[PDB]
Amino acid sequence: SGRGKGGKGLGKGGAKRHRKVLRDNIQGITKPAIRRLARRGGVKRISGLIYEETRGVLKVFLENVIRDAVTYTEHAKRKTVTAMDVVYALKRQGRTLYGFGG
Amino acid sequence: SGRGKGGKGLGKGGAKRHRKVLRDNIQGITKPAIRRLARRGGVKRISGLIYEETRGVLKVFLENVIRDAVTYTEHAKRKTVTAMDVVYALKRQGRTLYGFGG
Amino acid sequence: ARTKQTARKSTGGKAPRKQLATKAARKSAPATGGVKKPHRYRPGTVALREIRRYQKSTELLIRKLPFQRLVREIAQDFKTDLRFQSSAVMALQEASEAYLVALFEDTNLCAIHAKRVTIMPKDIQLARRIRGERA
Amino acid sequence: ARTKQTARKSTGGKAPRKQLATKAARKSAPATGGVKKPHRYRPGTVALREIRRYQKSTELLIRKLPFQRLVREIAQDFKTDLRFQSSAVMALQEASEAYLVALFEDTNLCAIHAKRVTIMPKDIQLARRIRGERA
Amino acid sequence: AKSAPAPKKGSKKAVTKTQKKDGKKRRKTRKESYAIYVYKVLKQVHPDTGISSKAMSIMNSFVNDVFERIAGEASRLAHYNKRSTITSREIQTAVRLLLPGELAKHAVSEGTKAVTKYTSAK
Amino acid sequence: AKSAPAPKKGSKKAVTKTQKKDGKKRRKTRKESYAIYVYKVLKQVHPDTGISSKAMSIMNSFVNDVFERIAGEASRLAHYNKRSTITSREIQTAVRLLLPGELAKHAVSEGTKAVTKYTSAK
Amino acid sequence: SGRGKQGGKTRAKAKTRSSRAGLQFPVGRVHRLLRKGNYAERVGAGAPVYLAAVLEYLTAEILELAGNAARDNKKTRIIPRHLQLAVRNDEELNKLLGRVTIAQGGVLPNIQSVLLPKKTESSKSKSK
Amino acid sequence: SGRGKQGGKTRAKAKTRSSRAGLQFPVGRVHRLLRKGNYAERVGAGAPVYLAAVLEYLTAEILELAGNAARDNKKTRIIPRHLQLAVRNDEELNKLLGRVTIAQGGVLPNIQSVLLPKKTESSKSKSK
DNA sequence: ATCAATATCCACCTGCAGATACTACCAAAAGTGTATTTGGAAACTGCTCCATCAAAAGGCATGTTCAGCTGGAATCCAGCTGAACATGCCTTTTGATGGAGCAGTTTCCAAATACACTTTTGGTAGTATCTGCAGGTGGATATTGAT
DNA sequence: ATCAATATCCACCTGCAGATACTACCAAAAGTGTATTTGGAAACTGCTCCATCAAAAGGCATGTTCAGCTGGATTCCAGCTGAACATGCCTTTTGATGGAGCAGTTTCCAAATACACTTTTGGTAGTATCTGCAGGTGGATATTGAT
Ligand SMILES: [Cl-]
Ligand SMILES: [Cl-]
Ligand SMILES: [Cl-]
Ligand SMILES: [Cl-]
Ligand SMILES: [Mn+2]
Ligand SMILES: [Mn+2]
Ligand SMILES: [Mn+2]
Ligand SMILES: [Mn+2]
Ligand SMILES: [Mn+2]
Ligand SMILES: [Mn+2]
Ligand SMILES: [Mn+2]
Ligand SMILES: [Mn+2]
Ligand SMILES: [Mn+2]
Ligand SMILES: [Mn+2]
Ligand SMILES: [Mn+2]
Ligand SMILES: [Mn+2]
Ligand SMILES: [Mn+2]
Ligand SMILES: [Mn+2]
Numbered sequence A, B: 001s002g003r004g005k006g007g008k009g010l011g012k013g014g015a016k017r018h019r020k021v022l023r024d025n026i027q028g029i030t031k032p033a034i035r036r037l038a039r040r041g042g043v044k045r046i047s048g049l050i051y052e053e054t055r056g057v058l059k060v061f062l063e064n065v066i067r068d069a070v071t072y073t074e075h076a077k078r079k080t081v082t083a084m085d086v087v088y089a090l091k092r093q094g095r096t097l098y099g100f101g102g
Numbered sequence C, D: 001a002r003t004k005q006t007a008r009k010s011t012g013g014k015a016p017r018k019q020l021a022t023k024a025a026r027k028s029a030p031a032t033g034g035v036k037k038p039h040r041y042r043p044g045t046v047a048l049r050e051i052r053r054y055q056k057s058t059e060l061l062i063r064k065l066p067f068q069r070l071v072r073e074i075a076q077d078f079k080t081d082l083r084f085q086s087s088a089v090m091a092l093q094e095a096s097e098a099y100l101v102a103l104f105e106d107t108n109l110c111a112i113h114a115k116r117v118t119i120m121p122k123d124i125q126l127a128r129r130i131r132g133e134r135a
Numbered sequence E, F: 001a002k003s004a005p006a007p008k009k010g011s012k013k014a015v016t017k018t019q020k021k022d023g024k025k026r027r028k029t030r031k032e033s034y035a036i037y038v039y040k041v042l043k044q045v046h047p048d049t050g051i052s053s054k055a056m057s058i059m060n061s062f063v064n065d066v067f068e069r070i071a072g073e074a075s076r077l078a079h080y081n082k083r084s085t086i087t088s089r090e091i092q093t094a095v096r097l098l099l100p101g102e103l104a105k106h107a108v109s110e111g112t113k114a115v116t117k118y119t120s121a122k
Numbered sequence G, H: 001s002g003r004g005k006q007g008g009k010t011r012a013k014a015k016t017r018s019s020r021a022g023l024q025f026p027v028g029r030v031h032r033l034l035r036k037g038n039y040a041e042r043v044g045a046g047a048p049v050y051l052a053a054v055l056e057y058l059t060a061e062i063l064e065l066a067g068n069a070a071r072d073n074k075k076t077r078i079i080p081r082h083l084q085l086a087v088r089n090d091e092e093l094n095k096l097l098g099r100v101t102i103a104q105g106g107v108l109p110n111i112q113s114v115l116l117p118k119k120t121e122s123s124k125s126k127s128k
Numbered sequence I: 001a002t003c004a005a006t007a008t009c010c011a012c013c014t015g016c017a018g019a020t021a022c023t024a025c026c027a028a029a030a031g032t033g034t035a036t037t038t039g040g041a042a043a044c045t046g047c048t049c050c051a052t053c054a055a056a057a058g059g060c061a062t063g064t065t066c067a068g069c070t071g072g073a074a075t076c077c078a079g080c081t082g083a084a085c086a087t088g089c090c091t092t093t094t095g096a097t098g099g100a101g102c103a104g105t106t107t108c109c110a111a112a113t114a115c116a117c118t119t120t121t122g123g124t125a126g127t128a129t130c131t132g133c134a135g136g137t138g139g140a141t142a143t144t145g146a147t
Numbered sequence J: 001a002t003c004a005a006t007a008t009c010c011a012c013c014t015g016c017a018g019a020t021a022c023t024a025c026c027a028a029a030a031g032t033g034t035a036t037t038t039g040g041a042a043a044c045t046g047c048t049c050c051a052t053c054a055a056a057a058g059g060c061a062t063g064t065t066c067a068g069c070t071g072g073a074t075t076c077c078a079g080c081t082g083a084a085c086a087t088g089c090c091t092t093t094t095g096a097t098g099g100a101g102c103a104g105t106t107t108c109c110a111a112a113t114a115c116a117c118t119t120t121t122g123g124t125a126g127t128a129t130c131t132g133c134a135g136g137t138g139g140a141t142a143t144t145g146a147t
Helices: A031-040 A050-075 A083-092 B031-040 B050-075 B083-092 C045-056 C064-078 C086-113 C121-131 D045-056 D064-076 D086-113 D121-131 E035-045 E053-080 E088-098 E101-118 F035-045 F053-080 F088-098 F101-119 G017-021 G027-036 G046-072 G080-088 G091-096 H017-021 H027-036 H046-072 H080-088 H091-096
Strands: A096-098 B096-098 G100-102 H100-102
Touching: A031 A050, A031 C045, A031 C086, A050 A083, A050 C064, A050 C086, A050 C121, A050 F053, A050 F088, A083 A096, A083 C086, A083 F053, A096 C086, A096 E053, B031 B050, B031 D045, B031 D086, B050 B083, B050 D064, B050 D086, B050 D121, B050 E053, B050 E088, B083 B096, B083 D086, B083 E053, B096 D086, B096 F053, C064 C086, C086 C121, C086 D086, C086 D121, C086 G100, C121 D086, C121 D121, D064 D086, D086 D121, D086 H100, E035 E053, E035 G046, E053 E088, E053 G027, E053 G046, E053 G080, E088 E101, E088 G046, E101 G017, E101 G046, E101 G091, F035 F053, F035 H046, F053 F088, F053 H027, F053 H046, F053 H080, F088 F101, F088 H046, F101 H017, F101 H046, F101 H091, G017 G027, G017 G046, G027 G046, G046 G080, G046 G091, G080 G091, G080 G100, H017 H027, H017 H046, H027 H046, H046 H080, H046 H091, H080 H091, H080 H100
Parallel strands: A096 G100, B096 H100
Antiparallel strands: none
């Protein structure tokens, strides 16, 4: 309840701190999910190569916004990315978002 | 004297003689100038309907930029549109132009 | 005639000209004449039904946890040891989905421009290039 | 082994030759009618030559006076009796031409996307919609 | 009787010591919003219509975004003209630059009407 | 009773002269630019290369543009963090947000170098 | 006149600049925000009045249209969806908010014509 | 030989801030412009130095590339065309100036392959 | 056109997350009063540069002829991609707990603002010399396209 | 393959728009000295909410089958658009005069800022209780698709 260590982040000792390696999570953006986004976009038929192409485009989109959001986070000396860090990052990339503050 | 139908002689097709004061103007942006613009843009073949389309687009662009430039002119209480008024108008429309800030 | 008595000639007799119509394909009547029956909507009908459904709703379309792991993975590659407000992740998801949906709208316009109804990678590529995201 | 055959004097491109007559004949059509297959570049060869010429230069491509007139006319709709600094008009022309040239590049990509080499109004329209100018 | 001077400024919750009623955990810094004003306007236009908190968060973003866009445009206008004061005149021109046709027209009318009224008092 | 102390080829003298103001400061509304500094840098990178006036104006616009973008980004950064001061740290972070990869690394390296030198400077 | 002392209250005391300008939005707050944002060294008295009036006006416009969308969808409470329908179906607000995303707004129903079925979908010579 | 604080001799503008920073760009002017730009209430001393250094560095990067372009075109004087060539052929400068128009800059030579002679076949080996 | 398989519509209903309602407190927000400072509007006008002529001189737009080759209509068909289905897993949901770390509160000085004063400098102006390269001429040779 | 008809390029030459070198002048740009103010980092810690665990279960993902109909390839040819010409309209230039009005300067006052008080108010917090509508059911009506 306020005891531990920190420094490098978090941790315990008597076997208690998680965080497994994160990899290949872009595959979590599934074919059904992309089909649903395309449907809301008014798309009726989709070529098989669209799914990997869409993952690639989303990865670039996310890398760009997250890069700026984390830059705001670090400049503020924080270790937690805030909704505001994301809103400002979105705004500076010309993707203004309403609903999350600011 | 009617004469001809296109070729030699005098009075034959292609014989106008005035200079504006309500005439061409947008029609003054010629098919040849538009073709040249397209060539610099890498275009090899042009539909006959492109010329009027281009005039329409160019008029919208100028209306937009000139409207804002004149808004800056009036705010300044001036009667003369300056290069800066145009530079500021272009910048706010996302079309920053370098070379005219003297 | 033949002046006798039979009542054969003509009236359906003589030869055929009557014993009409199709033979099968009503509900089943397995005698052969109309294949089987299981109900199927035609290709495209359900796709159109899904467009109407999803354009009427607003819920996020990517699963939440999988999207959250992608965000964490990418962020982690930029800077280790980050934590996220949960609304920061929802903000990224709202923005990401609106971005993709709008891009699919432009991509569809590109497929249609080429006389197709099927979007392909080149349509996405053309839309991103005209947008200035690529070239 | 001779000197004959030619005996084609030493110089002189004159056709009438060494005896009266002095027309402008040389090696074409001193008469009045045909020609014998004049020279013609194929459709597309000169268009390609123009693309290379204009992509190498930077001079404005729309005539100055007709452009100035258009600008003044448009401005008169927002405020009458305005004057323009000469560089204001030039700034507008530099910006307008750069805008149109870049739009033609996009329009060209749209034509090619549809398997054409000829740009059409629908290509300009698609490009402007994707850019968010129409949209 | 008397509040000032100091200290305390930014009180609430110091160690413990409490009389009655459990509240005010070390005063949160106030986060202002346009919500009560947005709500006031909503009732004028649609008396029996409510608004969800998410829609209200959207309205708050909208008002803050337009405020920043108009103020930024006014700022630039003032600097371009070497003026150190943003007056209603810079706001008006920023409005004409930022808003599309009919909206700018009605916005300019309301802004002008408000300044004229404001200056008609006292 | 005069002998025409001065002919008629312009204007005459007004008693005494001026060793300042009227000298030549009127239409002297100073209009500064980065031209002489851009010129100095061109010499360090290309000693035998010149630059046309039109090109120099492009450069002046360039420096002014980047200054505004970096300063504007630094401004928002400080405001977002509730800081009334723009320090080298805000300039650095603004540079990282505005400039593409390699350009940012070298810009940051140059900025950090100038501030260090400047610091360890008399 | 010369410091001294004063008495009586007619100007206001309890009269906000908002009431004085005939507004619902807060003139005092807008004035403070204009000063806090570093837009200029000085802010005239009329600037926050004009700006508050404009913000109030735009708010009324979006709420009018959004309440209409909620009514059209048989709802009495405005949610993000209604704001998005109001904005995207209005030419001018759509342009003002052209690069803005309203969270949980969805999109306008819109299927391109060429994608709808037809011709009874039966070849030309009775086939596929 | 004593005095104290050094606030005496050479009371003149000893060294400019730019000189102390090892810069060619005007630190004092950059300081003044930051202050008059209304970017923030206060401006720290190192901010105009860091910024002047970045402005000088970027200027050097573009002049280096435009000078190379002038040189490749057999010229010793940089004109707008050379700045355009320099920026557009540089991936990062091109992106930084992605929404900027260099007057009298022209465009980069570029013909879509499908438009080249003989149906469609890029070919070329000179610059391709 | 009839019939059937399903989707879709709507009335009716209930649970409940979110919305909404009073009581309580207060630190910042906001208004009123006086005094003091000053940004910039108003009037005058100097001189920069914008508008109009004048008026040849010919670069370039426009109209015409001809047909090459492009756009797009019409056909065929391999196989991609949508629809439907079985299976079962992993996202979602509901509830909990430690503790990282964001953020409130007071202290305290390095560094910024505020000023007076001295010095330095970039910009404006003349007047004057210098020079990179555009534009022109030869003539070579590369390209294009018919035979 | 041969070779004419043109386009295109390189080497050189020179006038001149435009860059450059030198001197003169000055307001303001900039730096230095000293005296005061203060933003915001430290340090300490209240208090939020982030990471993570648990367990259950059903919405939804996955993987497969089957074949409808789409995209891709091919062929054909009407007719649009490019290339080449013949005119001759009208932009371009340049030379040079009015005078509009931008822009420099001096006044001067309406309104801004600074400062000290006092009242007002929006936001935050604790508690409780409504209320709009999601989500579900059940039957009626509509849509789609086979014949
Ligand atoms: Cl593809
Ligand atoms: Cl078309
Ligand atoms: Cl005002
Ligand atoms: Cl600093
Ligand atoms: Mn990783
Ligand atoms: Mn003054
Ligand atoms: Mn034919
Ligand atoms: Mn073809
Ligand atoms: Mn801790
Ligand atoms: Mn000097
Ligand atoms: Mn040359
Ligand atoms: Mn303090
Ligand atoms: Mn499975
Ligand atoms: Mn088949
Ligand atoms: Mn097809
Ligand atoms: Mn006058
Ligand atoms: Mn209250
Ligand atoms: Mn329901």
